[PDB]
Amino acid sequence: EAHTLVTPEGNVIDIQGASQENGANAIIYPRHGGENQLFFIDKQIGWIISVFSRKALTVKENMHDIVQSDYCSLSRQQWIFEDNPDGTTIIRCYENPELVLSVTGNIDKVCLSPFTREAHQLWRIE
Amino acid sequence: EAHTLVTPEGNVIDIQGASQENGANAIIYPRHGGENQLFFIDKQIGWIISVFSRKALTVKENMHDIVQSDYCSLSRQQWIFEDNPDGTTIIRCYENPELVLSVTGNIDKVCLSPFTREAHQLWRIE
């Protein structure tokens, strides 16, 4: 079933432009419930797949930028989900689990950053 | 969400040995309901993924043998589902849609075969 990934402010991860193309950015955007803000999650595989494009959230080779791309079982496309008692989830890069799904300074783009329990590193998966 | 793929004789596609490894064979086996006889199907992307191993049904480069393997967005890992009025389904290889999921001579193993509407090319997805 499809999930939305929600920041503390109530905005959500969003595939920019509702693109179906490889390399499209994962951004932060106001909630509208469209399929480019919905994701399938498989904890056994570790993947996070855009419902609209069927492409996987992918860490680029620089280990910071996040895009969607065709899934090819890369460690940079696999995630470890660490649940917290308050219902949030830390989403850790399988290749380097110190690095977790985070947001940029503007809080408008998803990126990878070292875990400091910063507020926007604690995602709500609904 | 999990499906069984059933032959006319009532047997099912089965990942041999309940293996979790790349290269394990897709065989025909009597139904026992275990997870190595269950598959996720995403018609949008086209894959068929073993519930137990989370690996994708894959046509080998020889365009005949069917194994499970890590999904890599290969056309040999994508399928076209053609439904018939009788409730059966022809499962066509995206890379070469004349070739369809079929059974070997002694009803032993899954393979690809040119579509002729032979009885074992008509699957019941349950």
Q: With helix as H, strand as E and coil as C, how does chain A read?
A: CCECEECCCCCEEEEHHHCCCCCCEEEEECCCCCHHHCEEEECCCCEEEECCCCCEEEECCCCCEEEEECCCCCHHHCEEEEECCCCCEEEEECCCCCEEEEECCCCCEEEEEECCCCHHHCEEEC
Q: Note whether A94 contacts B: Cβ–Cβ < 8 A.
A: no
* Nearest chain B Cα distance for residue A112, angstroms: 23
Sheet-wide strand order for A110-114: A79-83, A89-93, A99-103, A110-114
Under 8 Å between Cβ of A50 and A74: no
A114: exposed, middle or buried (C-beta count within 10 Å: 0-12, 13-18, 19+)? exposed
Cβ contacts of residue A75 below 8 Å, gap of 6+?
Answer: A93, A94, A95
CA dihedral A90, A95, A97, A101 (to 10 degrees): -30
* Distances, alpha carbon A18 to alpha carbons A24, A51, A101, B25, B104, in Å: 9, 10, 20, 38, 43
CA distance B79 to A119: 42
Sheet-wide strand order for B79-83: B79-83, B89-93, B99-103, B110-114
Nearest to A51 by CA among A93, A75, A15: A15
Nearest to B57 by CA among B95, B40, B66: B66
**Biggest CA-to-CA distance, chain B:** 36
Nearest to A99 by CA among A82, A124, A83: A82
- The structure tokens listed for A34 are 């469209």
B70 CB neighbours in chain A (<8 A) are 73
CA distance B58 to B66: 6
Please provide residue A59's backbone torsions phi and psi, each rounded to the nearest 5 degrees: -75, 130
* Distances, alpha carbon A27 to alpha carbons A7, A82, A103, B47, in Å: 11, 22, 9, 27
Asked if A54 and B72 come within 8 Å (Cβ–Cβ), the reply is no
A54 CB neighbours in chain B (<8 A) are 42, 44-45
Strands B110-114 and B99-103, how do they pair? antiparallel
Under 8 Å between Cβ of B100 and B4: no
- The structure tokens listed for A25 are 């950015």
Domain range summary for chain A, segments of one domain joined by +: 1-126
Instruction: Name the method of structure determination.
Output: X-ray
Which chain B residue lies closest to A72 (C-alpha atoms)?
B72
Smallest Cβ–Cβ distance between B73 and the set A44, A45, A70 belongs to A70
Q: Note whether A2 contacts B: Cβ–Cβ < 8 A.
A: no
CA distance B28 to B104: 9
Q: Which residues pair with B40 in a beta bridge?
A: B49
Please provide residue B118's backbone torsions phi and psi, each rounded to the nearest 5 degrees: -65, 145
Strands B26-29 and B39-41, how do they pair? unpaired
Residue A42: alpha-carbon gap to chain centroid: 13
B54 CB neighbours in chain A (<8 A) are 42, 44-45
Residue whose pair of structure tokens reads 């992918």 in the numeric block: A58
CA distance A3 to A51: 9
Q: Any alpha helices (H) in B7-108, and if so which ranges?
A: none
Under 8 Å between Cβ of A84 and A122: yes
Cβ contacts of residue A24 below 8 Å, gap of 6+?
Answer: A15, A16, A17, A53, A55, A67, A68
